[PDB]
Amino acid sequence: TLNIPLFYKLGGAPVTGDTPIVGNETPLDNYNCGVPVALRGKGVAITKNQTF
Amino acid sequence: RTEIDVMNAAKQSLTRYFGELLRDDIIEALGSVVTTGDTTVNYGSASAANRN
Amino acid sequence: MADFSLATASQRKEWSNKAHMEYVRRSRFAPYIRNTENSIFQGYSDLEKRAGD
Amino acid sequence: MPATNSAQARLAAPGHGFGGNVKVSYGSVAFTGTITTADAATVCNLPVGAIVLGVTLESDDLDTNATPTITLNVGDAGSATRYFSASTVAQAGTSSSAPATTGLLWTVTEGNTAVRIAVANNAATSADGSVRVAVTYYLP
Amino acid sequence: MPATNSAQARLAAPGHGFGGNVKVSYGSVAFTGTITTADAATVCNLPVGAIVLGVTLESDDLDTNATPTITLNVGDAGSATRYFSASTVAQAGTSSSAPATTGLLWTVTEGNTAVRIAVANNAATSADGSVRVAVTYYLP
Amino acid sequence: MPATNSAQARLAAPGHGFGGNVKVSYGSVAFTGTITTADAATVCNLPVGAIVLGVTLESDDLDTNATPTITLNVGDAGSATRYFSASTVAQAGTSSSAPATTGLLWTVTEGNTAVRIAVANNAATSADGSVRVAVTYYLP
Amino acid sequence: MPATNSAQARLAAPGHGFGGNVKVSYGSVAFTGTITTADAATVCNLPVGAIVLGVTLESDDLDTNATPTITLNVGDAGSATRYFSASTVAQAGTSSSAPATTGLLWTVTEGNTAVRIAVANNAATSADGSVRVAVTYYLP
Amino acid sequence: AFSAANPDRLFFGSISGYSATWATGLGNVDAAETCTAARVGVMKRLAMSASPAITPMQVDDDEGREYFVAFHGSRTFRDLKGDTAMLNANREARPRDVSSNPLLQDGDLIYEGVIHREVPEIDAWAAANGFNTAGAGSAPIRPVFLCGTQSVFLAYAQRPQAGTEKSDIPALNRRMTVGMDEIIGVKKAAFNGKQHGVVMGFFGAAGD
Amino acid sequence: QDGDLIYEGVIHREVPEIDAWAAANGFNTAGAGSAPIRPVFLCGTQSVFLAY
């Protein structure tokens, strides 16, 4: 199988007036998607009773 | 637990948030309420007497 | 089957390194923000110099 | 139905660093002599932009009588009885260590940044002891 | 006799720096209109790997009746009544500022990182006010 | 009305070649000595991805009494009585060759790939004989 | 307790390919004229080293009487009644398609490789029909 | 559960016909709510204001242009190119040329920035899943898929390969078998229980 | 191929984020008979100042 990631956008409020850039944390969003893979096929037979 | 770089994904999405933050202020400035002589109040935080 | 039959919890997976983002739609006010006098949204770099509030 | 999300309705959200990981202020005022209702003293002092979480008041035995009657008030210059009103933890019969129950989550104003201890009722027989106050709060 | 030392049994031991010097989260939800049992709102949001220390609930007077009957619940999406169950601090006769007594020292799980306030009983006469919640915790 | 065509609803369809033209597994366990309920033995072993069609159980006369009471169970490590439950074909009065009636069309799981014979009831007078099992199945 | 694992106790174990994925032999003997107890005919022929799984016997209505009495035996040159004994499926009142119940899991010996049908009891009124036998087995 | 997780990406007969349950939402699309060119512009509007944004196929930052592709199933495609209005858009705004006009020589057609491609095999799919009933008053409905970029992932493990075999006897050529084999996996792009780049739309196609 | 369009000397530019602003300020009601209304901003030169 094969997993593919995704990052979202950014979400909060602009830290108005006084606030640090060390006090007030954000996470960044992150997700996954996995595609499974399988075998598959098809065949055809040919005789000689139906061929001459 | 991952292999994807969360650092570079958080720095690109942070320059791209201060671009949405600029035109969110121009839309808020166009819908302002000019009370009396440079007194511009936003439309949400304006009273009924500031709009009249 | 009854060949080499591998377990359900022993099957490999794989995780990709390339991630996707969300579209932003940059700005519709962008050709109109200049610093000249004949612009709609006019900018001032006077406080980018020495000091002020 | 019109109970919307709070005035907080949009942001992210704090952790490790220099924010307002909650704080204390501690004082140990020492009473001596005779104890009347003309007593006042600062134990600690608070910021301007801060919200209190809880006040802990522990004292010694100050009135050693068969019927104790000493009674304390904890507050500031605006309200003399803002945190504690008629505490009675300094009596020699009851227990100490009473937590605050009134006026907890409120922003300090200007001129209210000093916690006073004033004596509300006269002591029947004054002893020597000390009173401890610990005020928890934080900053934005 | 088989009461051994804890799952903690070997290490050193924390102080000054960037650890889990304890933290807060504060919200002020504003109720308005009429108040029924169809009310729900987030006040604050918590981490994943954190253990709660204590929740402080202070509110205004929301039901100004001769017989008040308003009743609040504080919890999260998993358990609607996890921290407070039948609080009754918003009534206009009783006192506010009740500390939490149930479910204190427990690690937050995934999907339980938002503190809700739901109204349990209908208000007899709805007033206008606000409700404040302060949740103390820390991180490893 | 919502009874649709099966999870099979689109393909062609098998014939001559290397598929799962149905198969057998045969064992002949030999009992000897005295026969108690502490007996267990594999007769044959099955694949993982296979579905059983039918189990045939033929035995000799193992308990030659006027009132026979020997009783067999056929199963695997998961369920001890999955194919046969209380067979009684080893008794010297009744007939042998009983086909399976329980648990036929089911996919073998992992750890269930060995057919056991366990004795359920004690033999009143143990004789010498053998028990034969033939299990039909196929593969995809 | 001495019930050990079988004479099979060490090997791996069969699947897809040219083994003994189970087999059939089918014959359709046609009875005509009058039907006495002097009748015998081969329907099919078996290997030497093979073990039988099951014999299916389907016939037509051969004795159309108010009281039918026709009766068949299926066997080989060694035992004339080895597979079926007193079948009575050719009667016009009962049902056909009886599976074999006696002598299933046994290795064919030399000179026993031809399945006969012999008539056991005379027909009260002979009709015209046919009898079908399908014998399932496999090889090592 | 697929509804009430995508309220900004599922378009029923109108936006005033959205429901949290799936069977009620398909009961709000009428037989008179056909696929005109004014309702496909509603689906382009939902794709430009989705809460996780759908990436368009082609962007022009100046004179702002965002392009999408809609896949019709030939019973909403004849109602789209055959309406009384919006049909003089490709005879009064196209150049006077015969071999390139999709009015005289039909094909895909662009209108308001979205390209309308016809796939005739969506009628074979949607008739087998019960869309010939389950509308408002048991009317036939058809789906329209307005998709952006990276909406379906394709994982290849083996390309299709061919092979032959002489079965019975290779000397007496009495039998032969040809065959073909493939390892592949197809899945719609889904993240956090939401469609990544598809906007589904249900219109009432009468099929006259 | 849609875009901005000029007619009678005025250029009509589309900004999709004015619906997000005006729905939050109560323009989905408060018309004649509680009908949704939207604002249109016809602006000239030097209408919003920006101080960096």
PDB file of C-alpha atoms in Angstrom, chain C:
ATOM      1  CA  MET C   1      -4.603 -20.570  -0.950  1.00  0.00           C
ATOM      2  CA  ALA C   2      -2.019 -23.115   0.187  1.00  0.00           C
ATOM      3  CA  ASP C   3       1.183 -21.761  -1.314  1.00  0.00           C
ATOM      4  CA  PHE C   4       3.422 -19.558   0.773  1.00  0.00           C
ATOM      5  CA  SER C   5       0.656 -17.747   2.659  1.00  0.00           C
ATOM      6  CA  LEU C   6       1.807 -14.553   4.338  1.00  0.00           C
ATOM      7  CA  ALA C   7       0.063 -13.117   7.379  1.00  0.00           C
ATOM      8  CA  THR C   8      -2.448 -10.276   7.372  1.00  0.00           C
ATOM      9  CA  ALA C   9      -0.525  -8.350  10.042  1.00  0.00           C
ATOM     10  CA  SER C  10       2.823  -9.024   8.342  1.00  0.00           C
ATOM     11  CA  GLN C  11       2.058  -7.152   5.103  1.00  0.00           C
ATOM     12  CA  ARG C  12       4.246  -4.098   4.476  1.00  0.00           C
ATOM     13  CA  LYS C  13       3.039  -0.509   4.091  1.00  0.00           C
ATOM     14  CA  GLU C  14       4.689   2.635   2.730  1.00  0.00           C
ATOM     15  CA  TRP C  15       4.453   6.325   3.659  1.00  0.00           C
ATOM     16  CA  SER C  16       5.221   9.084   1.153  1.00  0.00           C
ATOM     17  CA  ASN C  17       7.443  12.101   1.769  1.00  0.00           C
ATOM     18  CA  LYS C  18       5.636  14.569  -0.516  1.00  0.00           C
ATOM     19  CA  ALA C  19       2.800  16.396   1.228  1.00  0.00           C
ATOM     20  CA  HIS C  20      -0.054  18.501  -0.117  1.00  0.00           C
ATOM     21  CA  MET C  21      -1.250  21.914   1.047  1.00  0.00           C
ATOM     22  CA  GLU C  22      -4.523  23.835   0.949  1.00  0.00           C
ATOM     23  CA  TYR C  23      -5.171  26.444  -1.753  1.00  0.00           C
ATOM     24  CA  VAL C  24      -5.190  30.062  -0.562  1.00  0.00           C
ATOM     25  CA  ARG C  25      -6.305  32.333  -3.484  1.00  0.00           C
ATOM     26  CA  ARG C  26      -3.597  34.975  -2.920  1.00  0.00           C
ATOM     27  CA  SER C  27      -5.341  38.394  -3.170  1.00  0.00           C
ATOM     28  CA  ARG C  28      -7.803  40.301  -5.327  1.00  0.00           C
ATOM     29  CA  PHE C  29      -6.485  43.632  -3.986  1.00  0.00           C
ATOM     30  CA  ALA C  30      -2.914  42.969  -5.125  1.00  0.00           C
ATOM     31  CA  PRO C  31      -2.595  45.100  -8.340  1.00  0.00           C
ATOM     32  CA  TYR C  32      -4.017  48.113  -6.460  1.00  0.00           C
ATOM     33  CA  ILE C  33      -1.593  48.487  -3.528  1.00  0.00           C
ATOM     34  CA  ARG C  34       1.213  50.829  -4.587  1.00  0.00           C
ATOM     35  CA  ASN C  35       3.211  53.669  -3.021  1.00  0.00           C
ATOM     36  CA  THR C  36       2.536  56.348  -5.649  1.00  0.00           C
ATOM     37  CA  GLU C  37      -0.101  59.086  -5.550  1.00  0.00           C
ATOM     38  CA  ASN C  38      -2.458  57.717  -8.227  1.00  0.00           C
ATOM     39  CA  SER C  39      -3.136  54.402  -6.484  1.00  0.00           C
ATOM     40  CA  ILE C  40      -6.330  53.257  -4.795  1.00  0.00           C
ATOM     41  CA  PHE C  41      -4.747  51.791  -1.653  1.00  0.00           C
ATOM     42  CA  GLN C  42      -1.755  54.004  -0.890  1.00  0.00           C
ATOM     43  CA  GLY C  43       1.180  53.005   1.295  1.00  0.00           C
ATOM     44  CA  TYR C  44       3.478  55.160   3.418  1.00  0.00           C
ATOM     45  CA  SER C  45       7.049  54.203   4.319  1.00  0.00           C
ATOM     46  CA  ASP C  46       7.597  57.212   6.593  1.00  0.00           C
ATOM     47  CA  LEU C  47       7.515  55.129   9.780  1.00  0.00           C
ATOM     48  CA  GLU C  48       9.722  52.480   8.171  1.00  0.00           C
ATOM     49  CA  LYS C  49      12.305  55.236   8.580  1.00  0.00           C
ATOM     50  CA  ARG C  50      13.561  56.754  11.814  1.00  0.00           C
ATOM     51  CA  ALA C  51      10.774  56.362  14.440  1.00  0.00           C
ATOM     52  CA  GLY C  52       7.125  56.971  15.215  1.00  0.00           C
ATOM     53  CA  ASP C  53       3.759  55.678  16.360  1.00  0.00           C
TER      54      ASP C  53
END
